Amino acid sequence: NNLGTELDYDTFCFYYDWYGSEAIDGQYRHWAHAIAPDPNGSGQNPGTIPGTQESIASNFYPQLGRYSSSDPNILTKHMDMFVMARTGVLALTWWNEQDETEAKRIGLILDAADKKKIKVCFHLEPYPSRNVQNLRENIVKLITRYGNHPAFYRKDGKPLFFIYDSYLIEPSEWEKLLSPGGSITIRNTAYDALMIGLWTSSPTVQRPFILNAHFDGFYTYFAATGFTYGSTPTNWVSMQKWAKENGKIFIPSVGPGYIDTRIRPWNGSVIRTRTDGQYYDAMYRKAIEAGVSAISITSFNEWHEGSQIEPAVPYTSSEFTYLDYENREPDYYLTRTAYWVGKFRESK
Ligand SMILES: OC[C@H]1O[C@H](O[C@H]2[C@@H](O)[C@H](O)[C@@H](CO)O[C@@H]2O)[C@@H](O)[C@@H](O)[C@@H]1O
Ligand SMILES: OC[C@H]1O[C@H](O[C@@H]2C=CO[C@H](CO)[C@H]2O)[C@@H](O)[C@@H](O)[C@@H]1O
């Protein structure tokens, strides 16, 4: 078929499975969230957002309400939203919780994804004492456990992982895992993978980091333009040229906006207004114009940071007046994602 409705498997949408309900999880996990103290005096008592119907840890309000990430009926709905958005890859946050509830949820997500031909890759988070040895062990575990699942993502035969805050690990350690000669290499093994590191700051720092660490590519994550060098879209043409010259895969991250002031009240300078979709349009256009081979979307459902494309509805409670999609309908960001996926494919 040539309908212009099919999923794109070079489009990765960052997905968060950390939401809970009292009924399913025993707590409204993540809808309740600590308020961060301002990093710039002592004796702050910032408190917590309680995750009641009236007061959740987002400046927006989900169409699906305070949902559980373990609810198979929510997962079905999410996969139908990925189909509407044409986003073929779900990039799943992974915190190495080592608990049965995590294992269950990952299986449910893979199963629901496969029904709609969506693929799943892992976004490896900065879990406690993360290092290249336990990363290797965990890559082995994930490939062993999930590699034969029909929804497990591969690109030209290789799994792909995004590595958040990869700068927390020195290139000399990364080399041991990712150089073909590394002491604990995954290259040429059953556990080889495309490893996509986080490009943060200026080229003088990031170019040698990426080369010396032997990453296969890099992404930028942040939905807020200008937050880092890497999340400044006017740099993307030059970042892509460097990537192509050095055999690296650049996967710029685009998002519809940013606001996290319910959980970080002091972080207002990072707010990026959605402007009825114009912000998203501008950022997505820049990624496509850079001539990249793959794009990542921040985010499907990072509700705390206001980067979500998941449908949101107007809501005013006694405790908070939420933002909403304004003149646009709740599913606008899903259908606008599909529009941009089409433009990306036309360019590929
Ligand atoms: O603006 C807040 C910011 O917090 C988090 O990012 C932190 C860290 O993980 C990043 O590597 C650096 C990059 O300079 O910034 C912070 O210290 C994320 O939650 C991010 O989405 C958010 O914007
Ligand atoms: O937004 C609150 C959230 O912040 C941290 O998680 C990061 C936020 C966004 O994306 C990256 C990459 O997926 C996450 O690592 C962390 O402090 C969470 O506990 C917190 O809920």
Helices (H), 37-86: 72-85
Distance 260 CA to ligand 1 centre (A): 11
Experimental approach? X-ray
Atom of ligand 1 nearest to the CA of 264: 2
- Mutational test site, ligand 2, from 302, 303, 307, max ligand atoms within 8 Å of CB: 302
Question: Which ligand 2 atom minimizes the distance to the CA of 164?
Answer: 12
The residues near 293 (Cβ < 8 Å, ≥ 6 apart) are: 10, 249, 250, 348
Q: Which residues pair with 295 in a beta bridge?
A: 11
- CA 299 and chain centroid, separation: 5
Question: What separation, in Å, do the N-terminal and C-terminal C-alpha atoms of the chain show?
Answer: 18
Q: After which residues is the chain broken (C to N over 2.5 A)?
A: 40
Give the burial class of 91: count Cβ atoms within 10 A of its Cβ; 0-12 exposed, 13-18 middle, 19 or more buried. Answer: buried
In the block, residue with structure tokens 């890497």: 230
> How many Å lie between the centroid of ligand 1 and the Cα of residue 248?
24
Helices (H), the chain: 22-25, 72-85, 100-115, 132-146, 171-178, 203-213, 236-245, 278-289, 332-347
In 3-state terms, what secondary structure has residue 258? strand
Residue among 273, 293, 295 nearest 284 (CA)? 295
Residues with CB under 6 A from ligand 1: 165, 200, 222, 224, 227-228, 267, 270, 305
Contact (CB, 8 A) for 15 and 92: yes
Cα-to-centroid distance, 337 and ligand 2 (Å): 23
Which ligand has an atom closest to residue 123 CA?
2
Encode burial over 288-318: b for 16+ CB neighbours within 10 A, e otherwise: bebebebbbbbbbbbbbbbbbbbbbeebeee
91 forms bridges with which residues in the sheet? 14, 121
b/e per residue, 163-192, with b = 16+ CB within 10 A? bbebbebebebbbbbbeeebeebbeeeebb
Residue minimizing CA distance to atom 1 of ligand 2: 304
| Angle of the 236-245 helix axis to the 278-289 helix axis, nearest 10 | 30
Tokens 């799994």 found at: 159
Distance CA 81, CA 246 (A): 36
Could you tell me the CA-to-CA distances from 80 to 16, 247, 270 in Å, in that order? 16, 35, 31
Instruction: Give the distance (Å) from ligand 2 centre to CA of residue 190.
Output: 31
Residues paired with 312 in a beta bridge: 62
Nearest CA to ligand 2 atom 7: 125
Q: Is 259 left (phi over 0), alpha (psi -120 to 50) or beta?
A: beta
Q: Which atom of ligand 2 is nearest to the CA of 18?
A: 21
Domains of the chain: 1-348 (3.20.20.80)
Nearest partner of 219 among 193, 246, 242, 196, judged by Cα:
196
Backbone torsion region of residue 26, taken as left when φ is above 0, otherwise alpha when ψ lies between -120 and 50, otherwise beta: left
User: Could you tell me which of 232, 164, 181 has the C-alpha nearest to residue 202?
Assistant: 232
CA nearest to 131, candidates 181, 97, 166: 166
Give the Å distance between the CA of 153 and the centre of ligand 2: 23
Length of the chain (residues): 348
Distance CA 159, CA 143 (A): 8
Q: Per the structure block, which two tokens stand in for 310?
A: 């998941």
